[PDB]
């Protein structure tokens, strides 16, 4: 309960913000062009929050947060006073109406710029792309890549952190090989290696592209030391205190923490003989894991948070700039994201990216919950990414979207007159049908 509520709240706030910024771009550019905005609907369905401005503009918050619109003044929808005729949308030039229509996606892009600028002003952390472990017989193992190597670039594009590395790796789906400029950590002697991607197969929704290459990044190391023990837990009833060191679990010494994790998760109820050390004194204990609700089966909990040692700050990057520099870098980052979304849609259409791994609203909500839990410096880039996505999928040439408006408007500009009398209407309805079908298919592949 306490988790799903946070997820839904973060999802609703993210939606609200993005809808508001798109419709605000629409409304601002429209009002500046000289037309009169009537309704500023943020959401679909029955309205809940209606307010009226002095200029007659009605701001409306509805209940279905999966969209929104801006109702313009048009002679093709209501009878207009002879003086308000030039305040109508249809009585404007093709260029003005095209700008008013394109304002929305441009508003989303500008919101992404602003989010990344605010993040750069406040600063976003990051880890250097340094390999810690290499899985044998993998993509990177066969390319003469040794542990302790700092990735410098992917196909020439700079990769200062693991995030940019994954961002460039996902852009190589469908390719048979890729080129990575690497260097040992410390020495700036660059070297171009080539990863073979012919038999490469991974789901971007389920698999980390770094691990898909058999690469583990160097991160904070978990050590078999108890940081704190929650009260009224299995470890608390087992006699474990803060600062204890798990040495032996069921006869064999404890080498990794994932071993203890799997032993607690796959063995609920059954005892575990723990030989530990407390203040240099060896002790024996019997840990009986509980059985809290899990996914797929019954998982076991003990209430132990291990002690993690963060990797040295040598593998840390601070990405904060000054105001003007932050503006420049945010523009560059959002342009990169736009080009990457273009290439990703191209990959999905060309036939090498399955549509079943698409971002579904429940997955979007879980990601929003996780990000909002992580803080603001993570929630803002998430909002910027989803804003770029929304702005770029609405500029898609389809009758009901802003892009279809721009398309029919350009055809009117060339032809000298609106495309269709009612020949459009049968596409106006079919586009809404296709949008509802796409929404349903996206919701179903998420489930
Ligand atoms: C989550 N909904 C969307 O992303 C749809 C397009 C879509 C539908 C289904 C699947 C994928 C994309 N876009 C919009 O709702 C735009 C609103 C922005 C702020 C998101 C909106 C589209 S117009 C209208 C459609 C129905 C009544 S009014 C717009 O352009 N206002 O200026
Ligand atoms: Zn006037
Ligand atoms: Zn729009």
Swiss-Prot record:
Record organism: Escherichia coli (strain K12)
Induction trigger: Part of the sigma-E regulon. Also has a primary sigma-70 factor promoter.
Phenotype when changing residue 26 to F: Does not complement deletion mutant
Superkingdom: Bacteria
Compartments reported by the entry: Cell inner membrane
Protein name: Regulator of sigma-E protease RseP
Result when mutating residue 389 to C/G/L: Decreased substrate binding, retains some proteolytic activity
Miscellaneous comment in the UniProt entry for this protein: Regulated intramembrane proteolysis (RIP) occurs when an extracytoplasmic signal triggers a concerted proteolytic cascade to transmit information and elicit cellular responses. A membrane-spanning regulatory substrate protein is first cut extracytoplasmically (site-1 protease, S1P), then within the membrane itself (site-2 protease, S2P, this enzyme), while cytoplasmic proteases finish degrading the regulatory protein, liberating the effector protein.
